[PDB]
Amino acid sequence: RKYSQRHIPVMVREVIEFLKPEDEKIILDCTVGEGGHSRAILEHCPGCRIIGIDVDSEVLRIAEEKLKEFSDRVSLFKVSYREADFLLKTLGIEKVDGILMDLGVSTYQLKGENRGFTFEREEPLDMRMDLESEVTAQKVLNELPEEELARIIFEYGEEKRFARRIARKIVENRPLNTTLDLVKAVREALPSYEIRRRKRHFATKTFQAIRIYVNRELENLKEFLKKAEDLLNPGGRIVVISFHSLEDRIVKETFRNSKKLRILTEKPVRPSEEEIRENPRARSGRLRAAERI
Ligand SMILES: Nc1ncnc2c1ncn2[C@@H]1O[C@H](CSCC[C@H](N)C(=O)O)[C@@H](O)[C@H]1O
Numbered sequence: 001r002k003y004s005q006r007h008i009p010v011m012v013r014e015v016i017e018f019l020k021p022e023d024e025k026i027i028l029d030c031t032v033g034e035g036g037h038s039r040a041i042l043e044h045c046p047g048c049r050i051i052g053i054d055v056d057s058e059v060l061r062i063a064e065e066k067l068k069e070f071s072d073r074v075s076l077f078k079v080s081y082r083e084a085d086f087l088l089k090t091l092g093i094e095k096v097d098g099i100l101m102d103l104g105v106s107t108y109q110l111k112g113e114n115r116g117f118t119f120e121r122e123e124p125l126d127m128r129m130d131l132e133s134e135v136t137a138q139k140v141l142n143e144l145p146e147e148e149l150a151r152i153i154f155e156y157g158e159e160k161r162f163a164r165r166i167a168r169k170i171v172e173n174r175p176l177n178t179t180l181d182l183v184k185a186v187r188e189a190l191p192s193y194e195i196r197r198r199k200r201h202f203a204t205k206t207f208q209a210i211r212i213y214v215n216r217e218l219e220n221l222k223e224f225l226k227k228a229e230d231l232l233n234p235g236g237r238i239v240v241i242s243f244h245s246l247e248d249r250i251v252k253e254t255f256r257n258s259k260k261l262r263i264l265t266e267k268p269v270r271p272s273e274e275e276i277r278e279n280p281r282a283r284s285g286r287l288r289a290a291e292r293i
Pocket residue numbers: 008009010030031032033034035036037038053054055056059079080081082102103104105106129215220
């Protein structure tokens with residue numbers, strides 16, 4: 001076990017700082033998860049209203065209980081942020097004052113769902129954040145063409161040197177059934193000196209690659225970012241926390257190139273030294289923010 005047992009919102013102070021919840025602002029929490037950031041916003045601003053969404057019904061159950069004392073000011077929905085625009089319309093809301101995105105994995109997803117998001121223990125290769133979707137990590141690992149697995153591991157895992165060998169070992173280990181089977185494949189692909197050289201556990205990037213693919217995380221982010229600015233009232237703030245270089249690059253470029261947004265963070269805001277050790281889920285976190293102009 002590496003991740004903390006306690007669920008802690010990443011960079012909550014910086015989120016509050018850039019989102020500026022105050023007065024009676026309406027805030028869209030695009031990845032409400034267990035409600036960590038939303039609870040902090042509601043505690044910080046007595047007049048704000050939050051529309052919180054997620055695709056994982058199980059974490060929404062947790063958020064609904066955690067946010068119980070603020071139930072009159074926060075509402076939760078099971079919907080992809082890609083459809084947040086129409087969700088808001090069905091609620092009679094055309095624009096919001098703040099948009100928050102935390103692109104990681106929740107504590108409960110890592111430790112209690114038994115979906116194989118991580119490898120602290122032997123679990124099925126599922127990795128679906130929305131259990132209603134059909135594609136599982138197992139199906140991807142056992143059926144995708146080897147060249148596509150290589151592409152995924154290179155692009156989403158950022159394995160810039162060993163992507164092809166990892167894909168080869170995955171194919172050689174078929175059929176894979178558990179998280180330990182995937183760890184075995186990655187271990188066989190990397191030389192002992194390479195495993196020892198790495199800071200993070202050697203299977204980290206490959207697990208992340210498959211997760212992103214299964215949950216269309218990169219495609220979803222790119223599509224949402226194209227029009228997120230249209231959901232903001234003048235002066236509105238959009239804050240995004242990513243845990244992947246490619247996602248961060250996409251956010252940075254979107255904010256910079258946008259003619260409707262003024263980037264507020266030319267350089268990414270990163271977690272304090274203490275936070276990282278206290279909250280492993282904060283590892284690799286990069287926060288960017290922009291304002292509607
Ligand atoms: N397309 C999408 N739309 C909405 N939520 C999504 C999504 N893709 C992933 N998610 C959700 O994004 C969350 C990232 S973890 C977010 C943690 C939350 N900020 C907290 O403090 O509790 C997960 O719950 C995941 O299910």
